[PDB]
């Protein structure tokens, strides 16, 4: 009776482990690497809180014969822009460029949230808004931001590309789970939906962070350290 809470607790544990790992890895980080470690801690830390809240049975919203989880979407709204921020830092973006990508990202996240809380075919119009904004975000990540990253060191460009590929490819799967899951046609049950998202969230946040952590030493060596 309810392995849902079990899945949420597993997500919370995974995010917590990541949060602690990143925090520790950045204990003696330089003044240039600092923001990176702090950002990773924020990404996984907030996700950890969202999972704990859901595991405690809070934020469960039984929308029209379906079950949506408010904390999931709130988490996304607040964490995805930090992921974009991390990528933007590697690319070496200026305030303007950051504002563009963060705006697009927010449209995506807000669209999914609103659509999940909206009964009727109108939710598909909201989904469309998010889907289009997502394509714009992908364009910026693979285009303008990639060209910006190319002006950095080979190690930075290499890291940017690896994290960008992980992000683009895996983020592209979320809309399919939304459409096929409870928010959309509800072909996937809440349990299956939650299991898939727990897996994706851990990879896009914790996996994402570990890849960055694994590159840290090499990046320091590039500057003569």
């Amino acid at each position: 009776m309810v392995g849902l809470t079990t899945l949420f607790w597993l997500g919370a544990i995974g995010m917590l482990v990541g949060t602690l790992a990143f925090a520790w890895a950045g204990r003696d980080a330089g003044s240039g690497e600092r923001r990176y470690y702090v950002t990773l801690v924020g990404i996984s830390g907030i996700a950890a809180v969202a999972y704990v809240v859901m595991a405690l049975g809070v934020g469960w919203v039984p929308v029209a014969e379906r079950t949506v989880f408010a904390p999931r979407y709130i988490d996304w709204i607040l964490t995805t822009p930090l992921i974009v921020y991390f990528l933007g830092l590697l690319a070496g973006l200026d305030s303007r460029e950051f504002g563009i990508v963060i705006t697009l990202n927010t449209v995506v996240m807000l669209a999914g949230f609103a659509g999940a809380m909206v009964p009727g075919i109108e939710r598909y119009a909201l989904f469309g808004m998010g889907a289009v904004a997502f394509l714009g975000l992908v364009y910026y990540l693979v285009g303008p931001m990639t060209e910006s990253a190319s002006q950095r060191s080979s190690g930075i460009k290499s890291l940017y590309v690896r994290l960008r590929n992980l992000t683009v490819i895996l983020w592209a799967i979320y809309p399919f789970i939304w459409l096929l899951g409870p928010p959309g046609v509800a072909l996937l049950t809440p349990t299956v939906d939650v299991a898939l998202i727990v897996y994706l969230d851990l990879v896009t946040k914790v996996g994402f962070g570990f890849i960055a952590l694994d590159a840290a030493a090499t990046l320091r060596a590039e500057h003569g350290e």
């Binding site: 590929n165 592209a172 799967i173 072909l187 299956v192």
Partner: protein, 60 residues
């Protein structure tokens, strides 16, 4: 090696969870309930394959 094991193990884990839902539905006796759990399992496994493939391509 470790990646094949990882994705294989996880797939089995997902299958077990999916199987659990199908079994629970069957206990009710409602063919419709079982069908819903089964369709969810099939689609979920196909999506899981997508995630694993994407992960491999993004890292390897």
């Amino acid at each position: 090696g470790a990646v094949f094991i990882f994705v294989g193990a996880l797939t089995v884990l997902f299958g077990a969870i999916a199987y659990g839902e199908v079994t629970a539905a069957a206990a009710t006796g409602d063919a419709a309930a079982v069908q819903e759990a089964a369709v969810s399992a099939i689609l979920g496994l196909i999506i899981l394959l997508g995630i694993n493939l994407g992960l491999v391509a993004a890292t390897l």
